[PDB]
UniProtKB/Swiss-Prot annotation, chains A, B:
Family classification: Belongs to the histone deacetylase family. HD type 2 subfamily.
Highest taxon in the source lineage: Eukaryota
Organism of origin: Saccharomyces cerevisiae (strain ATCC 204508 / S288c)
Lineage: Eukaryota, Fungi, Dikarya, Ascomycota, Saccharomycotina
Job of this protein: Responsible for the deacetylation of lysine residues on the N-terminal part of the core histones (H2A, H2B, H3 and H4). Histone deacetylation gives a tag for epigenetic repression and plays an important role in transcriptional regulation, cell cycle progression and developmental events. Histone deacetylases act via the formation of large multiprotein complexes.
Additional remarks: Present with 3050 molecules/cell in log phase SD medium.
The protein's name: Histone deacetylase HDA1
Transmembrane segments: none
Localization, UniProt: Nucleus
Gene: HDA1
Length: 244, 244
């Protein structure tokens, strides 16, 4: 039986690309000279001329579907995309913010997602060095990282001076492993990162079973599951964003 | 939550198209002037110059995947295509037969698959009237219909004189409804159809809980599930094929 997991990852991002184009006319941010698909990064038009930007980073979205229990096969008509960034996108558009949506493919068929995290680091560095750094009108960025993909955000904070425009970082972690920030340029960054971040994790997390300050203010949600903790704490998150 | 079922149907057929091209260099049979995708019908090269053709008709393949039980989401790395026609394709290639593979999209989001069956009827009529009818070297066709898609086959038998080249029809039914053949051109066809068909259905089927001759020799397998009854009776099927 032939695996179908990679095809699915691309099918998911492509339907997302479709909705975001039809509904809010997003577009692609050519991440040329990297062997990643075009719709990896998507963004509001005239993003270059935007004041405030929300940048949402995530791994491929989950698919929920019922499953004929004994055949074990997936009910195609019940299949839906659980898009954890869509509500942040709609929230920011409704305040005329610039939106950047980054999609990082999961590393399937491997003990964990180390490699996906590395890709996340590389894409956010490309984004910052070739774009954004050359955005004239950008003032105030908020970063939202869903799942493992958040590694790319923390990496960028530590490997680029950034505090000129970065006002908030949010991480909806779930059951994933906490990402440390190890500053390279400035040690103040440790204190800044703790006072300007929210790291939302599953109630059932390994931690709390003592998180150190390099991790940046970890909070224990009352539920589990990325979708659940985002629903649970979307207001606390957006609240925290606006006060910066 | 946005449905994802249609995208999936196209993603499945497209990975199939990939394997069949890389592994046996299949190609597309332009079904022009119909608003169906290119990879609907796929076939061995030089099909026009083939003596014996196996024609395998099926609905979109199932996807099996484990599912994180409480989040309810699908394990992408465990996801696989359950391709019920692949073993017939490999069986026929290993005897140098011509292969034609027809894919009919399921009608998702509707009480049943009436519409898909109608599409199946239309594609096999297009195939027979614009192609095949004009194949010089074709002698001996066997039809294999998986699931509801078999309706297109029965329809063609009754709406076109066909017995010049059709030697066997096989239907791996499962739990679907039996397709009657109502001859239009010739009444002998009822007797021919019963003596030249095998209709394999699930042990748990509605029938046997008395099938009439218009249905063409229904057999009760010992298991349930298309994949299971094909595994169970692949030899009986191929056996029945060769004796014609």
């Amino acid at each position: 039986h032939h695996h179908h997991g990679s095809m699915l990852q691309k099918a998911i991002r492509q339907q997302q690309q479709h909705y975001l184009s039809d509904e809010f006319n997003f577009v692609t941010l050519p991440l040329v000279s990297m062997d990643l698909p075009d719709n990896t990064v998507l963004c509001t038009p005239n993003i270059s001329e935007s004041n405030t930007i929300i940048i949402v980073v995530h791994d491929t979205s989950d698919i929920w579907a019922k499953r004929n229990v004994i055949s074990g096969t997936i009910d195609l008509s019940s299949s839906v995309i659980i898009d954890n960034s869509l509500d942040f996108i709609k929230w920011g558009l409704d305040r005329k913010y610039g939106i950047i949506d980054v999609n990082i493919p999961l590393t399937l068929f491997e003990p964990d997602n180390y490699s996906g995290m590395i890709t996340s680091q590389e894409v956010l560095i490309y984004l910052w060095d070739n774009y954004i750094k050359y955005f004239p009108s950008v003032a105030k960025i908020a970063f939202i990282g869903i799942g493992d993909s958040y590694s790319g955000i923390v990496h960028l904070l530590g490997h680029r001076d950034t505090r000129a425009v970065t006002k908030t970082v949010i991480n909806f972690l779930g059951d994933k492993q906490l990402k440390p920030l190890v500053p390279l340029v400035d040690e103040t960054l440790s204190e800044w990162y703790f006072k300007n971040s929210l790291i939302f994790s599953n109630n059932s997390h390994q931690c709390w079973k003592k998180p150190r300050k390099k991790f940046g203010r970890v909070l224990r949600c009352d539920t589990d599951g990325l979708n659940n903790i985002i629903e649970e704490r979307f207001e606390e998150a957006t609240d925290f964003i606006l006060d910066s």
